[PDB]
Short mmCIF file of C-alpha atoms (C1' of nucleotides) and ligand atoms in Angstrom, two decimals:
data_model
loop_
_atom_site.label_atom_id
_atom_site.label_comp_id
_atom_site.label_asym_id
_atom_site.label_seq_id
_atom_site.Cartn_x
_atom_site.Cartn_y
_atom_site.Cartn_z
CA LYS A 339 34.09 39.70 57.49
CA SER A 340 34.87 36.35 59.12
CA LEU A 341 32.73 35.16 62.00
CA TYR A 342 35.91 33.89 63.68
CA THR A 343 39.61 34.51 64.08
CA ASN A 344 41.31 32.01 61.85
CA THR A 345 44.99 31.17 62.43
CA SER A 346 45.13 28.80 59.51
CA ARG A 347 48.66 29.90 58.62
CA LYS A 348 47.02 29.61 55.22
CA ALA A 349 44.97 32.53 56.66
CA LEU A 350 47.89 34.50 58.16
CA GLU A 351 49.99 34.39 55.00
CA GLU A 352 50.60 37.92 53.76
CA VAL A 353 50.48 37.79 50.01
CA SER A 354 52.14 39.90 47.36
CA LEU A 355 51.32 39.29 43.73
CA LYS A 356 53.97 39.20 41.05
CA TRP A 357 51.81 39.58 37.95
CA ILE A 358 48.15 39.85 36.97
CA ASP A 359 46.86 38.16 33.80
CA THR A 360 45.22 40.88 31.87
CA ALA A 361 44.73 39.14 28.54
CA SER A 362 41.38 38.79 26.81
CA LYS A 363 38.99 36.22 28.19
CA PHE A 364 36.76 36.40 25.14
CA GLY A 365 39.21 34.03 23.40
CA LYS A 366 42.74 32.63 23.60
CA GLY A 367 44.34 35.91 24.60
CA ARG A 368 47.97 36.37 23.65
CA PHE A 369 48.82 39.88 24.75
CA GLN A 370 48.42 41.88 27.98
CA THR A 371 48.37 45.45 26.67
CA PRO A 372 47.48 47.04 23.30
CA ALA A 373 51.02 48.27 23.46
CA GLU A 374 52.33 44.73 23.52
CA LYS A 375 50.17 43.57 20.65
CA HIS A 376 51.67 46.29 18.47
CA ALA A 377 55.30 45.70 19.41
CA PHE A 378 54.82 42.04 18.59
CA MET A 379 52.83 42.09 15.39
CA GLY A 380 54.21 45.24 13.88
CA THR A 381 52.34 47.83 11.90
CA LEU A 382 49.11 46.57 10.26
CA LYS A 383 47.12 47.53 7.13
CA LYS A 384 45.08 50.00 9.13
CA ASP A 385 47.18 52.34 11.35
CA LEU A 386 49.24 55.44 10.39
CA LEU B 3 0.15 61.88 14.48
CA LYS B 4 1.25 59.45 11.77
CA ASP B 5 3.17 60.75 8.76
CA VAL B 6 4.16 58.94 5.56
CA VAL B 7 7.88 58.11 5.34
CA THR B 8 10.29 56.00 3.42
CA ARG B 9 13.70 55.11 4.79
CA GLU B 10 16.38 52.60 3.86
CA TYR B 11 17.37 50.15 6.55
CA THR B 12 20.03 47.49 6.75
CA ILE B 13 18.95 44.57 8.91
CA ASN B 14 21.27 42.14 10.69
CA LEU B 15 19.56 38.86 9.86
CA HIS B 16 22.50 36.85 11.18
CA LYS B 17 22.15 37.55 14.88
CA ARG B 18 18.42 36.84 14.58
CA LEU B 19 18.72 33.52 12.85
CA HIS B 20 21.71 32.50 14.96
CA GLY B 21 20.88 29.03 16.17
CA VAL B 22 17.71 28.64 14.11
CA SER B 23 16.83 25.20 12.69
CA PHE B 24 17.93 25.12 9.07
CA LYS B 25 14.55 24.22 7.61
CA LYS B 26 13.24 27.25 9.56
CA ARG B 27 15.83 29.95 8.75
CA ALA B 28 14.38 31.52 5.61
CA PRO B 29 10.87 31.47 7.12
CA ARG B 30 12.29 33.06 10.26
CA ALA B 31 13.70 35.86 8.11
CA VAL B 32 10.25 36.67 6.67
CA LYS B 33 8.84 36.70 10.18
CA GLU B 34 11.85 38.45 11.68
CA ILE B 35 11.85 41.13 8.94
CA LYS B 36 8.17 41.82 9.50
CA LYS B 37 9.00 42.27 13.16
CA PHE B 38 11.58 44.80 11.93
CA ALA B 39 9.24 46.92 9.85
CA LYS B 40 7.08 47.11 12.98
CA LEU B 41 9.88 48.26 15.24
CA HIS B 42 10.69 51.25 13.10
CA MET B 43 7.29 52.90 12.55
CA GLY B 44 4.90 50.73 14.58
CA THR B 45 2.82 49.99 11.54
CA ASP B 46 1.65 46.51 12.61
CA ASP B 47 0.24 45.68 9.18
CA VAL B 48 3.31 44.75 7.12
CA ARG B 49 3.44 43.74 3.43
CA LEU B 50 6.61 42.42 1.76
CA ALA B 51 7.71 42.78 -1.83
CA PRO B 52 7.87 39.49 -3.73
CA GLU B 53 11.28 40.70 -4.87
CA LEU B 54 12.22 40.79 -1.20
CA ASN B 55 10.91 37.23 -0.84
CA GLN B 56 13.13 36.04 -3.69
CA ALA B 57 15.88 38.10 -2.20
CA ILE B 58 15.47 36.35 1.13
CA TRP B 59 15.08 32.84 -0.27
CA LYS B 60 17.82 33.67 -2.77
CA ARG B 61 20.04 30.84 -1.50
CA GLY B 62 17.60 28.28 -0.07
CA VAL B 63 15.96 27.64 3.33
CA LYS B 64 19.35 27.39 4.89
CA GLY B 65 21.42 30.24 3.51
CA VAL B 66 19.92 33.61 4.39
CA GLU B 67 22.43 36.42 3.76
CA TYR B 68 23.86 37.85 6.99
CA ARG B 69 22.64 41.40 6.31
CA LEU B 70 19.92 42.79 4.11
CA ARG B 71 19.58 46.33 2.98
CA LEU B 72 15.84 47.07 3.05
CA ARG B 73 13.62 49.84 1.78
CA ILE B 74 10.63 50.46 4.05
CA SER B 75 7.77 52.81 3.10
CA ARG B 76 5.04 53.65 5.62
CA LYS B 77 1.94 54.39 3.53
CA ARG B 78 -1.81 55.21 3.63
CA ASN B 79 -4.37 52.40 3.76
CA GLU B 80 -6.99 52.20 1.04
CA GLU B 81 -10.50 50.59 1.23
CA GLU B 82 -12.62 49.52 4.24
CA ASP B 83 -10.26 50.55 7.03
CA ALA B 84 -8.48 47.31 8.00
CA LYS B 85 -8.09 48.39 11.64
CA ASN B 86 -5.07 50.67 11.41
CA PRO B 87 -4.78 53.30 8.69
CA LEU B 88 -1.19 52.67 7.51
CA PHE B 89 1.03 49.99 5.87
CA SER B 90 4.68 49.36 5.67
CA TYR B 91 5.75 48.19 2.24
CA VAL B 92 9.15 46.51 2.28
CA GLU B 93 11.47 45.98 -0.71
CA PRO B 94 15.09 45.23 -1.58
CA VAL B 95 17.44 48.01 -2.50
CA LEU B 96 20.00 47.07 -5.18
CA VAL B 97 23.52 47.47 -3.82
CA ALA B 98 26.80 45.54 -4.14
CA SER B 99 27.42 44.85 -0.45
CA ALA B 100 24.99 45.71 2.37
CA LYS B 101 27.87 46.26 4.78
CA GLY B 102 28.75 49.69 6.13
CA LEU B 103 25.56 51.53 5.22
CA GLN B 104 23.82 53.53 7.89
CA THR B 105 20.09 54.18 7.91
CA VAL B 106 18.81 56.85 5.53
CA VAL B 107 15.75 59.01 4.92
CA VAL B 108 14.62 58.75 1.28
CA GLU B 109 13.27 62.14 0.20
CA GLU B 110 10.03 61.50 -1.71
CA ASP B 111 9.21 62.95 -5.13
"C1'" G C 1 27.02 12.89 -14.69
"C1'" U C 2 30.09 10.32 -11.24
"C1'" G C 3 31.00 5.01 -11.05
"C1'" A C 4 32.08 -1.92 -12.02
"C1'" A C 5 27.06 -0.73 -12.17
"C1'" C C 6 19.32 -0.90 -13.10
"C1'" A C 7 24.15 1.04 -6.16
"C1'" G C 8 24.50 5.53 -3.57
"C1'" C C 9 24.53 11.00 -4.52
"C1'" C C 10 23.15 15.28 -8.16
"C1'" U C 11 20.14 16.62 -12.64
"C1'" C C 12 16.42 16.68 -17.50
"C1'" U C 13 11.34 15.18 -19.38
"C1'" A C 14 6.77 14.39 -16.42
"C1'" G C 15 4.73 14.76 -11.50
"C1'" U C 16 4.11 16.37 -6.77
"C1'" U C 17 5.54 20.50 -2.76
"C1'" G C 18 0.20 16.41 0.32
"C1'" A C 19 0.52 14.62 5.47
"C1'" U C 20 -3.15 20.53 11.59
"C1'" A C 21 -0.83 24.99 12.72
"C1'" G C 22 1.77 29.15 16.01
"C1'" A C 23 5.38 30.32 20.31
"C1'" A C 24 9.35 28.47 23.18
"C1'" U C 25 13.95 24.89 23.64
"C1'" A C 26 12.87 22.68 31.40
"C1'" A C 27 13.28 17.60 32.85
"C1'" U C 28 12.86 12.59 30.95
"C1'" G C 29 12.70 10.76 26.18
"C1'" U C 30 12.88 8.72 20.37
"C1'" A C 31 16.33 9.21 16.37
"C1'" G C 32 21.32 11.19 15.00
"C1'" A C 33 26.66 12.61 16.55
"C1'" U C 34 31.41 13.61 19.64
"C1'" A C 35 34.65 12.73 23.87
"C1'" A C 36 40.85 13.99 27.49
"C1'" G C 37 43.56 9.28 29.90
"C1'" G C 38 42.62 4.05 30.39
"C1'" G C 39 40.85 0.14 26.92
"C1'" A C 40 36.00 -4.80 28.45
"C1'" A C 41 38.27 -3.28 34.66
"C1'" G C 42 31.21 -2.90 32.43
"C1'" U C 43 28.14 -7.58 31.62
"C1'" C C 44 25.16 -14.00 31.88
"C1'" G C 45 27.89 -12.75 27.54
"C1'" G C 46 31.68 -7.11 23.92
"C1'" C C 47 24.75 -6.61 24.15
"C1'" A C 48 25.20 -1.76 21.92
"C1'" A C 49 28.87 0.89 19.71
"C1'" A C 50 33.66 1.30 17.47
"C1'" A C 51 37.31 -0.29 14.15
"C1'" U C 52 38.05 -2.72 8.75
"C1'" A C 53 36.34 -1.69 3.75
"C1'" G C 54 37.11 0.33 -3.37
"C1'" A C 55 41.41 -0.48 -6.67
"C1'" U C 56 46.68 -1.49 -8.38
"C1'" C C 57 51.22 -4.01 -6.95
"C1'" C C 58 53.78 -7.18 -3.57
"C1'" G C 59 52.93 -10.81 -0.27
"C1'" U C 60 50.39 -15.07 2.02
"C1'" A C 61 50.30 -20.49 7.65
"C1'" A C 62 48.50 -25.05 9.84
"C1'" C C 63 45.40 -28.50 7.47
"C1'" U C 64 42.93 -30.59 3.21
"C1'" U C 65 38.34 -34.95 0.35
"C1'" C C 66 43.98 -31.46 -3.62
"C1'" G C 67 38.91 -28.67 -5.41
"C1'" G C 68 40.17 -25.57 -1.17
"C1'" G C 69 41.78 -22.84 3.14
"C1'" A C 70 42.41 -17.40 0.69
"C1'" U C 71 40.23 -10.85 -0.10
"C1'" A C 72 44.03 -16.05 4.93
"C1'" A C 73 47.39 -12.93 7.58
"C1'" G C 74 50.87 -8.78 6.54
"C1'" G C 75 52.32 -4.51 3.52
"C1'" A C 76 53.05 -0.09 -0.23
"C1'" U C 77 50.22 2.95 -3.19
"C1'" U C 78 45.84 6.32 -4.75
"C1'" G C 79 44.44 14.14 -5.95
"C1'" G C 80 45.81 17.88 -9.53
"C1'" C C 81 48.66 19.18 -13.66
"C1'" U D 1 -13.45 55.12 35.08
"C1'" U D 2 -17.85 59.44 36.96
"C1'" U D 3 -18.66 57.70 41.99
"C1'" G D 4 -13.69 59.93 45.70
"C1'" C D 5 -10.21 59.11 50.11
"C1'" U D 6 -8.37 59.79 55.35
"C1'" C D 7 -8.55 60.90 60.63
"C1'" C D 8 -12.01 62.74 65.19
"C1'" A D 9 -17.40 63.90 67.26
"C1'" C D 10 -22.54 62.05 67.75
"C1'" A D 11 -26.70 60.17 64.35
"C1'" C D 12 -29.77 56.13 62.20
"C1'" A D 13 -30.39 50.62 59.45
"C1'" A D 14 -28.27 46.28 59.50
"C1'" U D 15 -24.68 42.53 61.23
"C1'" A D 16 -22.03 39.52 64.36
"C1'" U D 17 -20.53 37.73 69.62
"C1'" A D 18 -17.36 30.07 73.20
"C1'" G D 19 -21.12 33.96 76.86
"C1'" A D 20 -20.19 41.90 81.28
"C1'" U D 21 -23.98 41.92 85.18
"C1'" G D 22 -19.75 45.57 92.42
"C1'" G D 23 -13.49 45.31 91.47
"C1'" A D 24 -8.04 40.70 87.24
"C1'" U D 25 -6.67 43.95 94.14
"C1'" A D 26 1.23 44.37 90.45
"C1'" C D 27 7.60 43.07 95.55
"C1'" G D 28 11.10 39.57 95.35
"C1'" A D 29 12.57 35.35 97.87
"C1'" A D 30 12.68 31.07 101.34
"C1'" U D 31 9.51 26.77 102.64
"C1'" A D 32 14.55 22.19 108.03
"C1'" A D 33 11.47 28.93 106.90
"C1'" G D 34 9.21 33.74 106.20
"C1'" G D 35 5.86 38.59 106.07
"C1'" C D 36 4.97 43.01 108.41
"C1'" G D 37 6.62 47.03 112.25
"C1'" U D 38 10.71 49.34 114.54
"C1'" C D 39 15.79 50.51 115.85
"C1'" C D 40 20.65 50.06 114.11
"C1'" U D 41 26.72 48.66 112.87
"C1'" U D 42 22.29 48.51 107.00
"C1'" G D 43 23.83 43.08 108.67
"C1'" U D 44 23.39 35.66 107.83
"C1'" G D 45 22.16 42.39 113.04
"C1'" G D 46 18.64 43.69 117.93
"C1'" C D 47 13.61 43.86 119.74
"C1'" G D 48 8.05 43.38 118.71
"C1'" U D 49 4.20 41.10 116.18
"C1'" C D 50 1.55 37.95 112.53
"C1'" G D 51 -0.03 33.02 109.89
"C1'" C D 52 -3.21 28.15 111.49
"C1'" U D 53 -5.84 30.83 104.40
"C1'" G D 54 -9.38 35.60 99.97
"C1'" A D 55 -14.92 33.29 105.63
"C1'" A D 56 -9.61 38.99 103.23
"C1'" C D 57 -9.31 43.94 101.34
"C1'" C D 58 -11.88 47.68 98.56
"C1'" A D 59 -16.49 49.17 97.18
"C1'" U D 60 -21.69 48.89 97.97
"C1'" A D 61 -28.31 52.71 100.64
"C1'" G D 62 -31.05 57.00 96.36
"C1'" C D 63 -37.19 56.41 89.55
"C1'" A D 64 -31.83 50.54 86.45
"C1'" G D 65 -31.38 55.00 91.37
"C1'" G D 66 -35.87 60.96 90.31
"C1'" C D 67 -37.10 66.43 91.98
"C1'" U D 68 -36.12 69.68 96.04
"C1'" A D 69 -33.91 72.84 100.75
"C1'" G D 70 -29.68 73.02 104.33
"C1'" C D 71 -25.40 72.00 108.12
"C1'" A D 72 -20.67 70.16 108.71
"C1'" A D 73 -16.01 69.04 105.88
"C1'" C D 74 -11.74 71.18 102.32
"C1'" G D 75 -12.59 65.53 102.16
"C1'" G D 76 -14.02 61.66 98.68
"C1'" U D 77 -15.08 60.61 93.37
"C1'" G D 78 -16.53 61.04 88.03
"C1'" C D 79 -15.72 63.86 83.82
"C1'" A D 80 -13.15 67.05 80.12
"C1'" C D 81 -8.59 70.08 80.76
"C1'" U D 82 -3.69 71.21 82.53
"C1'" U D 83 2.11 70.87 85.14
"C1'" G D 84 6.02 67.56 85.56
"C1'" G D 85 7.95 62.82 84.92
"C1'" C D 86 8.64 57.41 84.12
"C1'" G D 87 7.34 52.74 80.99
"C1'" G D 88 10.24 49.33 74.45
"C1'" A D 89 9.38 42.15 76.53
"C1'" A D 90 3.85 42.94 73.30
"C1'" A D 91 6.30 49.66 76.26
"C1'" G D 92 0.02 52.03 73.85
"C1'" G D 93 0.17 52.23 80.01
"C1'" C D 94 1.70 54.30 84.92
"C1'" C D 95 2.57 58.00 88.74
"C1'" U D 96 2.62 63.43 89.53
"C1'" U D 97 1.20 69.46 89.48
"C1'" G D 98 -2.78 73.28 89.00
"C1'" G D 99 -7.53 74.82 88.92
"C1'" G D 100 -12.65 73.94 86.46
"C1'" U D 101 -17.23 70.98 86.61
"C1'" G D 102 -21.15 67.27 88.08
"C1'" C D 103 -22.12 63.79 92.21
"C1'" U D 104 -21.32 63.10 97.18
"C1'" U D 105 -25.09 57.95 101.62
"C1'" G D 106 -20.45 62.65 106.51
"C1'" C D 107 -25.09 64.71 108.47
"C1'" U D 108 -30.70 67.15 108.76
"C1'" G D 109 -35.36 68.21 106.12
"C1'" G D 110 -39.61 68.81 102.11
"C1'" C D 111 -41.66 65.71 97.83
"C1'" G D 112 -42.06 61.37 94.25
"C1'" A D 113 -43.25 55.94 93.27
"C1'" A D 114 -49.11 52.34 93.07
"C1'" U D 115 -52.65 50.03 88.21
"C1'" U D 116 -46.27 46.62 84.97
"C1'" G D 117 -52.17 44.22 89.02
"C1'" C D 118 -48.97 37.30 92.66
"C1'" A D 119 -43.21 35.20 88.71
"C1'" A D 120 -42.78 35.03 82.91
"C1'" U D 121 -41.02 39.65 79.89
"C1'" G D 122 -35.64 42.66 82.71
"C1'" U D 123 -29.45 47.40 82.78
"C1'" C D 124 -27.74 47.36 77.79
"C1'" A D 125 -22.34 45.45 76.99
"C1'" U D 126 -18.92 45.49 71.84
"C1'" U D 127 -18.05 43.87 67.08
"C1'" U D 128 -17.80 44.77 62.39
"C1'" U D 129 -20.28 47.09 57.97
"C1'" G D 130 -22.75 50.28 55.12
"C1'" C D 131 -24.92 54.69 54.61
"C1'" G D 132 -25.81 60.72 57.01
"C1'" U D 133 -24.00 65.38 58.50
"C1'" G D 134 -19.36 69.65 60.24
"C1'" G D 135 -14.70 70.19 60.84
"C1'" G D 136 -9.67 69.08 60.09
"C1'" G D 137 -6.58 66.60 56.48
"C1'" A D 138 -3.81 64.19 52.24
"C1'" U D 139 -3.80 64.58 46.26
"C1'" A D 140 -0.62 57.49 44.65
"C1'" A D 141 0.35 53.01 42.69
"C1'" A D 142 0.04 47.70 41.05
"C1'" U D 143 -1.29 44.66 37.16
"C1'" C D 144 -2.05 43.56 31.60
"C1'" A D 145 0.87 44.62 27.40
"C1'" U D 146 5.77 45.99 25.46
"C1'" U D 147 11.27 45.09 26.96
"C1'" U D 148 16.16 42.76 29.66
"C1'" G D 149 18.25 37.46 30.18
"C1'" U D 150 22.03 37.67 36.12
"C1'" A D 151 15.72 34.13 35.15
"C1'" U D 152 12.60 30.61 32.90
"C1'" A D 153 8.48 24.09 30.98
"C1'" C D 154 3.90 27.44 31.73
"C1'" G D 155 3.11 30.71 35.77
"C1'" A D 156 7.04 32.95 38.37
"C1'" C D 157 11.99 35.78 38.73
"C1'" U D 158 15.09 39.99 37.16
"C1'" U D 159 15.74 44.63 34.21
"C1'" A D 160 13.92 48.84 31.11
"C1'" G D 161 10.33 52.51 29.09
"C1'" A D 162 6.96 59.97 29.83
"C1'" U D 163 12.55 64.28 26.73
"C1'" G D 164 17.11 61.22 29.62
"C1'" U D 165 24.17 61.13 31.91
"C1'" A D 166 17.25 57.74 27.93
"C1'" C D 167 16.26 53.63 24.98
"C1'" A D 168 16.43 51.02 20.42
"C1'" A D 169 18.20 50.12 15.07
"C1'" C D 170 22.38 50.69 12.38
"C1'" G D 171 27.34 52.46 11.59
"C1'" G D 172 32.52 53.11 14.07
"C1'" G D 173 36.37 51.48 17.41
"C1'" G D 174 38.40 47.58 20.74
"C1'" U D 175 38.09 42.03 21.52
"C1'" A D 176 38.13 37.43 19.26
"C1'" U D 177 38.08 33.08 15.21
"C1'" U D 178 40.20 31.40 10.70
"C1'" G D 179 45.03 31.63 7.85
"C1'" U D 180 46.05 35.27 3.50
"C1'" A D 181 39.92 37.13 -0.06
"C1'" A D 182 38.12 39.24 -5.10
"C1'" G D 183 40.80 41.65 -8.62
"C1'" C D 184 45.28 43.07 -11.04
"C1'" A D 185 50.26 41.98 -11.90
"C1'" G D 186 55.14 38.97 -12.69
"C1'" U D 187 61.73 37.49 -18.15
"C1'" A D 188 57.66 32.45 -11.09
"C1'" G D 189 55.98 27.69 -13.20
"C1'" A D 190 57.10 20.89 -15.09
"C1'" G D 191 56.19 21.63 -20.22
"C1'" U D 192 53.53 20.94 -25.06
"C1'" A D 193 51.84 23.13 -29.46
"C1'" G D 194 51.54 27.52 -33.20
"C1'" C D 195 53.87 31.67 -36.02
"C1'" C D 196 57.23 35.06 -37.50
"C1'" U D 197 61.33 39.83 -38.84
"C1'" U D 198 64.66 32.81 -35.72
"C1'" G D 199 65.87 35.29 -31.07
"C1'" U D 200 72.76 39.24 -26.40
"C1'" U D 201 65.26 38.68 -22.83
"C1'" G D 202 61.42 36.60 -29.61
"C1'" U D 203 56.42 36.78 -29.15
"C1'" U D 204 51.17 33.54 -29.13
"C1'" A D 205 47.97 30.02 -27.04
"C1'" C D 206 47.38 26.22 -23.30
"C1'" G D 207 49.23 25.18 -17.83
"C1'" A D 208 48.33 22.35 -11.48
"C1'" U D 209 50.67 25.59 -8.96
"C1'" C D 210 53.85 29.78 -7.03
"C1'" U D 211 54.91 35.03 -5.71
"C1'" G D 212 53.25 40.50 -4.65
"C1'" C D 213 49.82 43.98 -3.30
"C1'" U D 214 47.90 40.49 1.75
"C1'" G D 215 48.71 38.42 9.28
"C1'" A D 216 44.97 39.73 3.94
"C1'" G D 217 39.67 38.90 3.50
"C1'" A D 218 35.31 36.84 5.80
"C1'" U D 219 32.76 36.61 10.90
"C1'" U D 220 32.43 38.77 15.64
"C1'" A D 221 26.39 38.72 20.43
"C1'" A D 222 22.79 36.20 18.84
"C1'" G D 223 23.88 35.77 26.83
"C1'" C D 224 31.60 39.92 24.28
"C1'" C D 225 33.42 45.18 25.74
"C1'" U D 226 32.67 50.19 23.97
"C1'" U D 227 30.66 54.76 21.45
"C1'" U D 228 31.02 63.11 20.56
"C1'" G D 229 28.12 59.30 14.21
"C1'" U D 230 23.42 58.43 11.62
"C1'" U D 231 18.08 57.47 12.13
"C1'" G D 232 13.97 56.41 15.11
"C1'" U D 233 11.05 56.06 19.56
"C1'" C D 234 8.80 57.95 24.11
"C1'" U D 235 0.71 58.74 28.04
"C1'" G D 236 -2.46 51.71 24.72
"C1'" A D 237 -5.16 48.30 28.53
"C1'" U D 238 -6.79 47.08 33.42
"C1'" U D 239 -7.40 46.99 38.76
"C1'" U D 240 -7.02 48.58 43.72
"C1'" G D 241 -9.23 52.17 49.87
"C1'" U D 242 -8.21 51.71 56.66
MG1 LIG E 1 36.97 32.46 27.81
MG1 LIG E 2 22.04 25.80 19.33
MG1 LIG E 3 17.26 25.36 0.29
MG1 LIG E 4 16.36 0.12 -16.85
MG1 LIG E 5 17.36 11.38 -1.35
MG1 LIG E 6 -0.53 11.02 -10.82
MG1 LIG E 7 -0.88 12.35 11.04
MG1 LIG E 8 37.60 8.20 25.49
MG1 LIG E 9 45.33 -0.16 23.43
MG1 LIG E 10 31.82 -7.46 37.89
MG1 LIG E 11 29.15 -10.51 35.14
MG1 LIG E 12 34.74 -10.10 33.75
MG1 LIG E 13 27.20 -6.84 17.61
MG1 LIG E 14 37.33 7.32 16.34
MG1 LIG E 15 51.18 11.22 -7.97
MG1 LIG E 16 10.48 37.50 112.85
MG1 LIG E 17 16.43 40.87 111.85
MG1 LIG E 18 -6.18 41.60 102.03
MG1 LIG E 19 -36.64 54.00 84.51
MG1 LIG E 20 0.04 40.24 75.45
MG1 LIG E 21 -39.67 33.06 86.59
MG1 LIG E 22 20.80 33.22 30.49
MG1 LIG E 23 25.21 55.10 27.21
MG1 LIG E 24 14.13 52.06 16.93
MG1 LIG E 25 49.99 37.17 2.47
MG1 LIG E 26 29.58 58.20 24.29
MG1 LIG E 27 18.13 62.23 18.39
#
RNA sequence: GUGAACAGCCUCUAGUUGAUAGAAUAAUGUAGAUAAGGGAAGUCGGCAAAAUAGAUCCGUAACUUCGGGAUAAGGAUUGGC
RNA sequence: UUUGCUCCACACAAUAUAGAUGGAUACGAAUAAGGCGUCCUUGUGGCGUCGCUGAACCAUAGCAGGCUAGCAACGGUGCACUUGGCGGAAAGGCCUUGGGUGCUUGCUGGCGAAUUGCAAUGUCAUUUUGCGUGGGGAUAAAUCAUUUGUAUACGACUUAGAUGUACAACGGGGUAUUGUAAGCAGUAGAGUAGCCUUGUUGUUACGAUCUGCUGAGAUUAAGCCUUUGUUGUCUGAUUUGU
């Protein structure tokens, strides 16, 4: 916890996120969910 | 105890030569493969088949295959007991691709 | 063999595989490379580096001792079948 | 590792000591002001006294302090116990309750001392450390090596390893990179050249390339994530005690 009571305005701003990047970091991630990968690429040679 | 076996292992040479200086990659494989026969069955004294050597050097200093399927027999030492009483003989198993094989006990007869 | 070629690169005959070796990959090095945007603002000074480069066709200034300058410059092209 | 180890008693042989030889004796505060006593209206109060130094207070007599008999006190003091409490600034100490026990120089007696020869030379204090006994007690870890890579020149750092919710080696899945593998097939393909029954699709050879199976195949921890699978592994070395 802070050692002091900051009133930075920058420190009183209540924040609410709109979206959280959830792509792969192990590479240039394109998709957020396995769901989304499917919907976009369609059915592959594996699967079904 | 220490009992004679003979299993068939597939080694990932690639992740072990990853980064190695080209002139040193085949010789690292000989050394790295010895280190592998020692891991399974801490035999310490390891001998390689000269077919394995060829097999390793099959594509030059620089181009060691990413995976090798190996046969490794732990055996009984003969003559004036060179410290430990057991070898590992190592040799190449003929197979199309060394991908996708698990490790297997070879039943001896 | 490629190619203008006794070049460079690869091979045959013949000959070597001989230059202490093992384990790691801190700094700083010696040798080799690459950098977004800018493009000599660096520096005594473009030093170092970079860029150009074969060949075919077109094209080609001042000046000149008429021989040159001149591959001046500036362009297009190039595999395979 | 065979010896061990720990606390308390009293017992020897070493060993050391910045220097025992009646007592380090506890308000706070002011100083052009205070202490102590006493009363009170508990206050910047009233009265009394003190300093002018600790030249004080306390203790001190007994073979380096012996042996012995009594009176008077009901006290003093030492020791080992015991009842309550308080003390954290480094409290490791302080007050308090109950007996027990030795001493008592408060007082009155009976003995002792020499010859250590006229001073040298004489009370033994407390540190450690090893051994000895008798009792109570407790029954681990660190390092080497091997391993991780949140670490690293080497040392060092950080993980892991004795049957596990373990660890490794492989396999699987997810993640990523590239850009569509080998093989087979095509009345795809600029065309040329053969041969026949000379073409309601004529075949045969040669042919960059194209198309399909094929966002296919290859690679993916080496410092990526993950696992109902397979197989394997799991007590070598060394060192340490108040
Ligand atoms: Mg990334
Ligand atoms: Mg590297
Ligand atoms: Mg080679
Ligand atoms: Mg010649
Ligand atoms: Mg050369
Ligand atoms: Mg010669
Ligand atoms: Mg030399
Ligand atoms: Mg640049
Ligand atoms: Mg420019
Ligand atoms: Mg300047
Ligand atoms: Mg300058
Ligand atoms: Mg300048
Ligand atoms: Mg230059
Ligand atoms: Mg460039
Ligand atoms: Mg052309
Ligand atoms: Mg007064
Ligand atoms: Mg007064
Ligand atoms: Mg006094
Ligand atoms: Mg005496
Ligand atoms: Mg102190
Ligand atoms: Mg004297
Ligand atoms: Mg690291
Ligand atoms: Mg697990
Ligand atoms: Mg294993
Ligand atoms: Mg495709
Ligand atoms: Mg699991
Ligand atoms: Mg198992």
